[PDB]
Amino acid sequence: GSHMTEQTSTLYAKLLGETAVISWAELQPFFARGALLQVDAALDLVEVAEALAGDDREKVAAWLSGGGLSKVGEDAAKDFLERDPTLWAVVVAPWVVIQERAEKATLH
């Protein structure tokens, strides 16, 4: 049971591959330590995740001050829990980012 040192760029292939859908209750150890970032329904997962992987500071900090990107505490915890709770989670190299599944406005 030797833990495979993940030196492969499978994370790149995952992040820029597609989004992932999971239950919120699986992400409990992630927001507990604070390794969980919340993204708004207006934005997308790939654009916030590439920013947090690529260290794109103007991209990240624009959404931090703009309120499109945040971190998941107790307020966001009970929010997502009582919202879906099934939501779109994409694991970036440092941390995971989540968007709500329930898009209340979908006009295309």
Token pair listed for 6? 């993940």
Site of tokens 């295309």: 108
Partners of 87 in the β-ladder: 22
- Distances 9 to 4, 35, 39, 50 between C-alpha atoms, Å: 13, 20, 24, 14
Cβ atoms of 82 and 71 within 8 Å: the answer is no
Distance CA 35, CA 97 (A): 9
SS3 87: strand
Query: Within a 10 A sphere around the Cβ of 24, how many other Cβ atoms?
Result: 23
Which residue type, as a one-letter code, is found at position 42? A
In 27-105 the beta strands, taken as DSSP E runs, fall at 36-39, 69-71, 87-91, 96-99
Phi, psi of 91 (to 5 degrees): -80, 115
Partners of 36 in the β-ladder: 96
Domain boundaries, the chain: 1-108
